[PDB]
Ligand binder design. Sequence first.
Ligand code: NA
Ligand code: NA
Length: 274
Amino acid sequence: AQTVPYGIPLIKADKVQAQGFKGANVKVAVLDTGIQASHPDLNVVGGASFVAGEAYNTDGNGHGTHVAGTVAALDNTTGVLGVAPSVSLYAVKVLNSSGSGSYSGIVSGIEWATTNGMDVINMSLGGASGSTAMKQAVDNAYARGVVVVAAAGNSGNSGSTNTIGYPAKYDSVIAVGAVDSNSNRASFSSVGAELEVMAPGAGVYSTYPTNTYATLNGTXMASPHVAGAAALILSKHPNLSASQVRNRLSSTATYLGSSFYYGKGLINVEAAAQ
Ligand code: NA
Ligand code: NA
C-alpha cells in the first residue's frame, strides 16, 4: 500500500536506506508554507511561524507539505516514502498560503533554524534579488555547520542568461536543478554558473494537504531530494562537516552534460555516502 516515488530509486536513496541508514536523529527544517502536521504520513517534531495569522503546523497552500513528504514521508504501509524517513522534521513557516514571503520573514526562519540546531535547511523558494541580510544569514548558517539547500529556480534558460535565483545563487547554498524520470533536464529548470547538482523535479508525487497525495513539478521538488540526501550521509557519517557533505554530493554526481545546464550532475546518494 506504500508507493515509492521514482525519485527515491533514481538517486539511489533506497540503496542507503537498505544499509539501514534513514536519517534518524538528523534535524531537518523545511522553510516553506508550513506543513499539515496532522497528515498520517508525516511526523512533525516542532517548528515556528514567521507569517502573520498562521501557525506553523498548518499548510493552507500545499507546497510545504509536498516538499516535506519528499524529505521525510514515513516508511510504513501507506502513502509514499521519503528520502530520509527517520529524520526529525521541523516546519518553519516563512511563506504564506499564497506561496509568497518577505525577506525578513525568510531571514528569521534561517536564524531560527541556525539557533535551534538544525543540521539541514531546505529552502524550496527563491526571488530575483537577494539582500545583504539574507546573504549574511545563509553564510552564518553554513559557517556554523548547517547544510543549506535551495531550489535553483523555474526560469529555464535564455541563451546564455544566468537565471539562478536567490538564495541558491549565494556560494554557501547548494543550488539544485531538476531532472525528470528519464534523467533529462526539465525545461523549466534554471541555468547558470551557480547550478550545482540536479535531482528529480518533474512529476514528483508526495504528501499533500488534507491527508492525500499529489504530483507537482518544480526545482522546489528537486531541492528536498538533496536535503534528504544530506540527512542520509549525516546518519551514516555523523562526523562530517557541512563542507564535506556538500563536496560528497557534488563530486560523486552522475555527469549529464554541461555544468551551465546540469551543474555537476544528478546526485547519487549511494556513492556520496560511501
Ligand atoms: Na508512507
Ligand atoms: Na549556491
